[PDB]
Tab-separated table of all heavy atoms in Angstrom:
chain	number	residue	atom	x	y	z
B	206	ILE	N	38.664	41.708	35.594
B	206	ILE	CA	37.502	40.831	35.669
B	206	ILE	C	37.786	39.616	34.803
B	206	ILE	O	38.669	39.641	33.946
B	206	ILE	CB	36.209	41.558	35.222
B	207	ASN	N	37.044	38.539	35.037
B	207	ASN	CA	37.091	37.360	34.185
B	207	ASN	C	35.940	37.454	33.194
B	207	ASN	O	34.773	37.496	33.596
B	207	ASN	CB	36.993	36.078	35.011
B	208	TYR	N	36.265	37.500	31.906
B	208	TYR	CA	35.233	37.685	30.897
B	208	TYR	C	34.403	36.433	30.660
B	208	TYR	O	33.332	36.531	30.056
B	208	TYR	CB	35.859	38.144	29.579
B	209	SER	N	34.860	35.266	31.116
B	209	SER	CA	34.100	34.041	30.890
B	209	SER	C	32.796	34.041	31.679
B	209	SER	O	31.740	33.684	31.141
B	209	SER	CB	34.949	32.827	31.256
B	209	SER	OG	34.609	31.710	30.454
B	210	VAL	N	32.844	34.432	32.953
B	210	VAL	CA	31.619	34.495	33.745
B	210	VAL	C	30.704	35.590	33.212
B	210	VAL	O	29.474	35.445	33.206
B	210	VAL	CB	31.947	34.692	35.238
B	210	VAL	CG1	32.982	35.781	35.425
B	210	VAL	CG2	30.686	35.008	36.029
B	211	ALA	N	31.285	36.694	32.740
B	211	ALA	CA	30.482	37.737	32.111
B	211	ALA	C	29.765	37.207	30.877
B	211	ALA	O	28.585	37.501	30.660
B	211	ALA	CB	31.367	38.929	31.749
B	212	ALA	N	30.466	36.421	30.058
B	212	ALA	CA	29.850	35.839	28.871
B	212	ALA	C	28.755	34.853	29.245
B	212	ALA	O	27.713	34.796	28.584
B	212	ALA	CB	30.909	35.156	28.010
B	213	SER	N	28.980	34.055	30.287
B	213	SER	CA	27.944	33.132	30.739
B	213	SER	C	26.707	33.890	31.205
B	213	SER	O	25.574	33.488	30.916
B	213	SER	CB	28.485	32.240	31.854
B	213	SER	OG	28.732	32.986	33.031
B	214	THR	N	26.909	34.995	31.926
B	214	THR	CA	25.785	35.830	32.337
B	214	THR	C	25.061	36.412	31.130
B	214	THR	O	23.826	36.427	31.084
B	214	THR	CB	26.272	36.947	33.255
B	214	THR	OG1	26.754	36.381	34.480
B	214	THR	CG2	25.146	37.918	33.557
B	215	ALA	N	25.818	36.891	30.140
B	215	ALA	CA	25.206	37.449	28.940
B	215	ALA	C	24.381	36.400	28.207
B	215	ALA	O	23.289	36.693	27.709
B	215	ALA	CB	26.282	38.027	28.022
B	216	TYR	N	24.894	35.170	28.127
B	216	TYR	CA	24.108	34.078	27.563
B	216	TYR	C	22.843	33.849	28.376
B	216	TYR	O	21.767	33.617	27.814
B	216	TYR	CB	24.945	32.803	27.496
B	216	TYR	CG	24.159	31.573	27.107
B	216	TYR	CD1	23.925	31.271	25.775
B	216	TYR	CD2	23.663	30.708	28.071
B	216	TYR	CE1	23.209	30.147	25.415
B	216	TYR	CE2	22.946	29.584	27.720
B	216	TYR	CZ	22.723	29.308	26.392
B	216	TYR	OH	22.009	28.186	26.039
B	217	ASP	N	22.952	33.903	29.704
B	217	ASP	CA	21.758	33.880	30.537
B	217	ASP	C	20.946	35.160	30.400
B	217	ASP	O	19.742	35.150	30.677
B	217	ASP	CB	22.137	33.653	31.999
B	217	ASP	CG	21.108	32.830	32.744
B	217	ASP	OD1	19.900	33.022	32.497
B	217	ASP	OD2	21.506	31.988	33.574
B	218	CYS	N	21.575	36.256	29.975
B	218	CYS	CA	20.877	37.508	29.721
B	218	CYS	C	20.246	37.557	28.335
B	218	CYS	O	19.630	38.570	27.989
B	218	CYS	CB	21.834	38.690	29.895
B	219	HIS	N	20.407	36.500	27.537
B	219	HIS	CA	19.783	36.348	26.226
B	219	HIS	C	20.299	37.346	25.197
B	219	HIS	O	19.647	37.570	24.175
B	219	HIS	CB	18.255	36.436	26.321
B	219	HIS	CG	17.621	35.249	26.975
B	219	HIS	ND1	18.166	34.629	28.079
B	219	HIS	CD2	16.492	34.564	26.678
B	219	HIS	CE1	17.397	33.615	28.435
B	219	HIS	NE2	16.375	33.553	27.601
B	220	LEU	N	21.456	37.960	25.439
B	220	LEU	CA	22.113	38.797	24.437
B	220	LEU	C	23.266	37.986	23.852
B	220	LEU	O	24.431	38.144	24.218
B	220	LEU	CB	22.581	40.110	25.051
B	220	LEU	CG	21.593	40.767	26.018
B	220	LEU	CD1	22.168	42.049	26.591
B	220	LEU	CD2	20.262	41.036	25.332
B	221	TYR	N	22.918	37.112	22.905
B	221	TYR	CA	23.853	36.088	22.450
B	221	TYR	C	25.044	36.690	21.719
B	221	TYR	O	26.165	36.185	21.832
B	221	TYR	CB	23.127	35.080	21.566
B	221	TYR	CG	21.973	34.411	22.265
B	221	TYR	CD1	20.700	34.956	22.220
B	221	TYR	CD2	22.156	33.242	22.980
B	221	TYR	CE1	19.643	34.351	22.860
B	221	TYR	CE2	21.106	32.630	23.623
B	221	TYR	CZ	19.850	33.188	23.560
B	221	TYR	OH	18.799	32.579	24.203
B	222	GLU	N	24.824	37.757	20.952
B	222	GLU	CA	25.945	38.430	20.305
B	222	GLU	C	26.887	39.037	21.337
B	222	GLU	O	28.114	38.959	21.194
B	222	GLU	CB	25.422	39.494	19.342
B	222	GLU	CG	24.505	38.948	18.258
B	222	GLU	CD	23.060	38.805	18.709
B	222	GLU	OE1	22.825	38.582	19.915
B	222	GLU	OE2	22.156	38.909	17.854
B	223	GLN	N	26.332	39.636	22.393
B	223	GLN	CA	27.164	40.152	23.474
B	223	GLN	C	27.901	39.022	24.181
B	223	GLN	O	29.069	39.171	24.564
B	223	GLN	CB	26.307	40.944	24.461
B	223	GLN	CG	27.104	41.746	25.478
B	223	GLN	CD	26.473	43.089	25.790
B	223	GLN	OE1	27.169	44.082	25.995
B	223	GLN	NE2	25.148	43.126	25.828
B	224	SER	N	27.229	37.883	24.366
B	224	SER	CA	27.889	36.731	24.964
B	224	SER	C	29.056	36.268	24.107
B	224	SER	O	30.117	35.920	24.632
B	224	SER	CB	26.888	35.596	25.163
B	224	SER	OG	25.618	36.105	25.517
B	225	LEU	N	28.881	36.258	22.785
B	225	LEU	CA	29.979	35.871	21.907
B	225	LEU	C	31.109	36.890	21.950
B	225	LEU	O	32.283	36.518	21.866
B	225	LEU	CB	29.478	35.680	20.478
B	225	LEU	CG	29.571	34.244	19.958
B	225	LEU	CD1	29.037	34.139	18.547
B	225	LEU	CD2	31.009	33.767	20.011
B	226	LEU	N	30.779	38.176	22.078
B	226	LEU	CA	31.825	39.190	22.203
B	226	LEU	C	32.648	38.970	23.467
B	226	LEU	O	33.885	39.021	23.441
B	226	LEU	CB	31.207	40.589	22.200
B	226	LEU	CG	32.164	41.787	22.144
B	226	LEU	CD1	33.437	41.469	21.370
B	226	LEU	CD2	31.470	43.000	21.552
B	227	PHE	N	31.976	38.718	24.588
B	227	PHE	CA	32.703	38.456	25.825
B	227	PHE	C	33.500	37.160	25.730
B	227	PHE	O	34.638	37.083	26.208
B	227	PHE	CB	31.734	38.422	27.003
B	227	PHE	CG	31.131	39.756	27.324
B	227	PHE	CD1	29.871	39.846	27.885
B	227	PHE	CD2	31.824	40.922	27.059
B	227	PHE	CE1	29.317	41.071	28.180
B	227	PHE	CE2	31.275	42.149	27.351
B	227	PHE	CZ	30.020	42.224	27.912
B	228	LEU	N	32.926	36.135	25.100
B	228	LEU	CA	33.640	34.877	24.936
B	228	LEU	C	34.902	35.064	24.108
B	228	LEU	O	35.959	34.523	24.449
B	228	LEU	CB	32.725	33.837	24.293
B	228	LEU	CG	32.807	32.416	24.844
B	228	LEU	CD1	32.298	32.370	26.263
B	228	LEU	CD2	32.017	31.468	23.970
B	229	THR	N	34.821	35.835	23.020
B	229	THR	CA	35.999	36.000	22.178
B	229	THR	C	37.030	36.927	22.807
B	229	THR	O	38.229	36.724	22.601
B	229	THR	CB	35.618	36.496	20.783
B	229	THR	OG1	36.792	36.547	19.964
B	229	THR	CG2	35.007	37.868	20.838
B	230	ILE	N	36.614	37.914	23.604
B	230	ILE	CA	37.617	38.702	24.316
B	230	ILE	C	38.325	37.839	25.358
B	230	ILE	O	39.555	37.903	25.509
B	230	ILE	CB	36.997	39.979	24.923
B	230	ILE	CG1	38.092	40.970	25.310
B	230	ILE	CG2	36.133	39.691	26.129
B	230	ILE	CD1	39.046	41.271	24.197
B	231	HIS	N	37.573	36.984	26.060
B	231	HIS	CA	38.197	36.086	27.025
B	231	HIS	C	39.155	35.124	26.339
B	231	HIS	O	40.264	34.885	26.829
B	231	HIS	CB	37.131	35.312	27.795
B	231	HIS	CG	37.696	34.319	28.758
B	231	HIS	ND1	37.229	33.028	28.859
B	231	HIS	CD2	38.700	34.429	29.659
B	231	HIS	CE1	37.920	32.385	29.783
B	231	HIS	NE2	38.819	33.212	30.284
B	232	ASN	N	38.744	34.564	25.201
B	232	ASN	CA	39.605	33.642	24.473
B	232	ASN	C	40.809	34.354	23.875
B	232	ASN	O	41.843	33.725	23.628
B	232	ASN	CB	38.808	32.935	23.382
B	232	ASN	CG	39.656	31.991	22.568
B	232	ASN	OD1	40.138	32.344	21.494
B	232	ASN	ND2	39.851	30.783	23.078
B	233	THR	N	40.693	35.657	23.622
B	233	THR	CA	41.859	36.420	23.209
B	233	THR	C	42.821	36.625	24.368
B	233	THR	O	44.038	36.677	24.159
B	233	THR	CB	41.431	37.766	22.627
B	234	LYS	N	42.302	36.745	25.591
B	234	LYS	CA	43.194	36.904	26.736
B	234	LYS	C	43.730	35.563	27.227
B	234	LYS	O	44.941	35.319	27.200
B	234	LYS	CB	42.481	37.640	27.873
B	234	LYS	CG	43.250	37.611	29.185
B	234	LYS	CD	43.582	39.010	29.674
B	234	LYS	CE	44.649	38.988	30.758
B	234	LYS	NZ	45.979	39.404	30.234
B	235	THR	N	42.842	34.676	27.672
B	235	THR	CA	43.245	33.458	28.364
B	235	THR	C	43.363	32.241	27.456
B	235	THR	O	43.968	31.245	27.867
B	235	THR	CB	42.254	33.138	29.488
B	235	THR	OG1	41.001	32.740	28.920
B	235	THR	CG2	42.040	34.353	30.373
B	236	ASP	N	42.814	32.296	26.241
B	236	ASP	CA	42.762	31.137	25.348
B	236	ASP	C	42.125	29.940	26.049
B	236	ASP	O	42.579	28.802	25.921
B	236	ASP	CB	44.153	30.785	24.815
B	236	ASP	CG	44.979	32.011	24.484
B	236	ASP	OD1	45.495	32.658	25.418
B	236	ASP	OD2	45.116	32.329	23.285
B	237	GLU	N	41.059	30.204	26.797
B	237	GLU	CA	40.444	29.229	27.690
B	237	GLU	C	38.930	29.226	27.524
B	237	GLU	O	38.172	29.284	28.494
B	237	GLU	CB	40.836	29.521	29.135
B	237	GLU	CG	40.783	28.320	30.062
B	237	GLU	CD	41.309	28.638	31.447
B	237	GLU	OE1	42.545	28.636	31.629
B	237	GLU	OE2	40.488	28.896	32.352
B	238	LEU	N	38.469	29.164	26.279
B	238	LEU	CA	37.037	29.192	26.012
B	238	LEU	C	36.349	27.960	26.590
B	238	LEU	O	36.922	26.869	26.631
B	238	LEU	CB	36.778	29.283	24.507
B	238	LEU	CG	36.931	28.007	23.677
B	238	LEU	CD1	36.081	28.089	22.425
B	238	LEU	CD2	38.387	27.758	23.318
B	239	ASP	N	35.116	28.146	27.054
B	239	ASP	CA	34.304	27.055	27.582
B	239	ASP	C	33.551	26.415	26.423
B	239	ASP	O	32.597	26.996	25.896
B	239	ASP	CB	33.346	27.563	28.654
B	240	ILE	N	33.980	25.211	26.033
B	240	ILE	CA	33.464	24.580	24.821
B	240	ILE	C	31.971	24.298	24.944
B	240	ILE	O	31.203	24.529	24.003
B	240	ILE	CB	34.265	23.302	24.513
B	240	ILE	CG1	35.542	23.655	23.753
B	240	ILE	CG2	33.428	22.319	23.719
B	240	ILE	CD1	35.295	24.434	22.485
B	241	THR	N	31.536	23.796	26.101
B	241	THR	CA	30.109	23.580	26.307
B	241	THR	C	29.342	24.896	26.242
B	241	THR	O	28.257	24.967	25.649
B	241	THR	CB	29.870	22.885	27.646
B	241	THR	OG1	30.452	21.576	27.614
B	241	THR	CG2	28.380	22.766	27.931
B	242	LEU	N	29.899	25.953	26.836
B	242	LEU	CA	29.264	27.262	26.751
B	242	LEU	C	29.210	27.754	25.312
B	242	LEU	O	28.211	28.346	24.888
B	242	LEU	CB	30.003	28.266	27.631
B	242	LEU	CG	29.343	29.638	27.759
B	242	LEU	CD1	27.869	29.490	28.105
B	242	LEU	CD2	30.064	30.479	28.798
B	243	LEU	N	30.278	27.523	24.543
B	243	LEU	CA	30.278	27.932	23.143
B	243	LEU	C	29.204	27.195	22.355
B	243	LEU	O	28.525	27.791	21.511
B	243	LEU	CB	31.652	27.696	22.523
B	243	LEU	CG	31.684	27.738	20.998
B	243	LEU	CD1	31.357	29.129	20.506
B	243	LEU	CD2	33.034	27.290	20.480
B	244	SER	N	29.042	25.894	22.607
B	244	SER	CA	27.987	25.145	21.933
B	244	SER	C	26.611	25.668	22.318
B	244	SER	O	25.729	25.810	21.461
B	244	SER	CB	28.105	23.657	22.260
B	244	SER	OG	28.850	22.979	21.265
B	245	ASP	N	26.411	25.969	23.603
B	245	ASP	CA	25.129	26.511	24.039
B	245	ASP	C	24.849	27.857	23.382
B	245	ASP	O	23.704	28.159	23.028
B	245	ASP	CB	25.106	26.638	25.563
B	245	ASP	CG	24.501	25.426	26.239
B	245	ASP	OD1	23.622	24.781	25.631
B	245	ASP	OD2	24.904	25.116	27.381
B	246	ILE	N	25.884	28.683	23.221
B	246	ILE	CA	25.723	29.970	22.552
B	246	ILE	C	25.352	29.769	21.089
B	246	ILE	O	24.375	30.342	20.594
B	246	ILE	CB	27.008	30.806	22.695
B	246	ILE	CG1	27.045	31.507	24.051
B	246	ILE	CG2	27.119	31.822	21.571
B	246	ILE	CD1	28.230	32.426	24.221
B	247	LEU	N	26.114	28.933	20.378
B	247	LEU	CA	25.902	28.765	18.945
B	247	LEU	C	24.624	28.004	18.630
B	247	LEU	O	24.181	28.020	17.478
B	247	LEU	CB	27.098	28.056	18.312
B	247	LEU	CG	28.381	28.880	18.189
B	247	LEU	CD1	29.305	28.291	17.138
B	247	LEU	CD2	28.063	30.325	17.869
B	248	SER	N	24.027	27.332	19.615
B	248	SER	CA	22.760	26.653	19.368
B	248	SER	C	21.637	27.649	19.096
B	248	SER	O	20.774	27.402	18.246
B	248	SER	CB	22.404	25.753	20.551
B	248	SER	OG	22.849	24.426	20.332
B	249	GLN	N	21.626	28.775	19.807
B	249	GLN	CA	20.533	29.735	19.725
B	249	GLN	C	20.886	30.994	18.941
B	249	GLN	O	20.089	31.937	18.923
B	249	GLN	CB	20.065	30.120	21.128
B	249	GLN	CG	19.314	29.028	21.864
B	249	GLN	CD	18.180	29.576	22.707
B	249	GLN	OE1	17.490	30.513	22.305
B	249	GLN	NE2	17.984	28.998	23.886
B	250	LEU	N	22.046	31.035	18.299
B	250	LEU	CA	22.454	32.242	17.585
B	250	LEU	C	21.541	32.477	16.385
B	250	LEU	O	21.277	31.542	15.620
B	250	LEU	CB	23.905	32.123	17.136
B	250	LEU	CG	24.651	33.428	16.875
B	250	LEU	CD1	24.702	34.255	18.138
B	250	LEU	CD2	26.049	33.120	16.392
B	251	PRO	N	21.036	33.699	16.189
B	251	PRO	CA	20.060	33.933	15.111
B	251	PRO	C	20.606	33.727	13.707
B	251	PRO	O	19.810	33.522	12.781
B	251	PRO	CB	19.637	35.392	15.331
B	251	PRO	CG	20.016	35.698	16.747
B	251	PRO	CD	21.249	34.899	17.011
B	252	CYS	N	21.919	33.783	13.512
B	252	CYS	CA	22.481	33.630	12.176
B	252	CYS	C	22.166	32.239	11.633
B	252	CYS	O	22.369	31.243	12.340
B	252	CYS	CB	23.992	33.857	12.195
B	253	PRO	N	21.658	32.128	10.401
B	253	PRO	CA	21.290	30.800	9.883
B	253	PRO	C	22.460	29.834	9.794
B	253	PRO	O	22.282	28.631	10.018
B	253	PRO	CB	20.706	31.117	8.498
B	253	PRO	CG	20.357	32.575	8.542
B	253	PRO	CD	21.386	33.195	9.427
B	254	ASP	N	23.654	30.323	9.473
B	254	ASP	CA	24.816	29.450	9.322
B	254	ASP	C	25.589	29.314	10.630
B	254	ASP	O	26.812	29.434	10.681
B	254	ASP	CB	25.708	29.973	8.205
B	254	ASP	CG	24.927	30.330	6.962
B	254	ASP	OD1	23.706	30.070	6.945
B	254	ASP	OD2	25.525	30.869	6.007
B	255	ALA	N	24.858	29.050	11.702
B	255	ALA	CA	25.411	28.656	12.985
B	255	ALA	C	25.116	27.177	13.190
B	255	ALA	O	24.577	26.512	12.303
B	255	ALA	CB	24.835	29.514	14.113
B	256	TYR	N	25.470	26.665	14.367
B	256	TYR	CA	25.373	25.269	14.778
B	256	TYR	C	26.487	24.444	14.137
B	256	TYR	O	26.648	23.278	14.486
B	256	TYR	CB	24.009	24.630	14.439
B	256	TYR	CG	23.492	23.580	15.400
B	256	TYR	CD1	22.134	23.468	15.654
B	256	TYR	CD2	24.347	22.699	16.042
B	256	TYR	CE1	21.645	22.518	16.524
B	256	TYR	CE2	23.871	21.745	16.913
B	256	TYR	CZ	22.520	21.659	17.152
B	256	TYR	OH	22.043	20.707	18.020
B	257	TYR	N	27.277	25.009	13.227
B	257	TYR	CA	28.360	24.281	12.579
B	257	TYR	C	29.723	24.874	12.891
B	257	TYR	O	30.731	24.406	12.351
B	257	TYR	CB	28.143	24.229	11.064
B	257	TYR	CG	26.858	23.549	10.656
B	257	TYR	CD1	25.642	24.203	10.760
B	257	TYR	CD2	26.862	22.251	10.174
B	257	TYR	CE1	24.470	23.592	10.398
B	257	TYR	CE2	25.693	21.630	9.807
B	257	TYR	CZ	24.500	22.308	9.922
B	257	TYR	OH	23.328	21.696	9.561
B	258	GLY	N	29.780	25.903	13.735
B	258	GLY	CA	31.066	26.459	14.112
B	258	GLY	C	31.900	25.486	14.921
B	258	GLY	O	33.098	25.322	14.674
B	259	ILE	N	31.280	24.822	15.889
B	259	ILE	CA	31.943	23.825	16.717
B	259	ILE	C	31.416	22.457	16.315
B	259	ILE	O	30.200	22.228	16.314
B	259	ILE	CB	31.709	24.086	18.213
B	259	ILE	CG1	32.074	22.845	19.027
B	259	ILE	CG2	30.264	24.490	18.470
B	259	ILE	CD1	31.961	23.040	20.513
B	260	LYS	N	32.324	21.552	15.966
B	260	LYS	CA	31.941	20.189	15.634
B	260	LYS	C	31.877	19.373	16.921
B	260	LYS	O	32.818	19.382	17.722
B	260	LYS	CB	32.907	19.567	14.621
B	260	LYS	CG	34.285	19.200	15.150
B	260	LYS	CD	35.312	19.150	14.034
B	260	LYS	CE	35.497	20.512	13.398
B	260	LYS	NZ	36.495	20.479	12.294
B	261	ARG	N	30.747	18.715	17.140
B	261	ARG	CA	30.616	17.758	18.224
B	261	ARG	C	30.930	16.378	17.669
B	261	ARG	O	30.381	15.986	16.634
B	261	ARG	CB	29.210	17.793	18.821
Side-chain angles (χ1 to χ4, degrees), chain B residues 209-217 219-232 234-238 240-251 253-260:
Chain B
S209 211
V210 47
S213 68
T214 294
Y216 172 84
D217 214 321
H219 289 40
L220 318 179
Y221 302 90
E222 302 84 331
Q223 191 142 217
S224 324
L225 245 179
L226 188 31
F227 292 151
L228 221 67
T229 184
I230 196 53
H231 177 226
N232 178 263
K234 169 121 195 104
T235 69
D236 321 76
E237 205 174 279
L238 78 155
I240 277 304
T241 295
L242 187 49
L243 165 66
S244 266
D245 266 330
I246 278 184
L247 288 200
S248 266
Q249 289 217 38
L250 203 61
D254 313 355
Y256 213 145
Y257 300 77
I259 165 176
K260 72 204 64 180

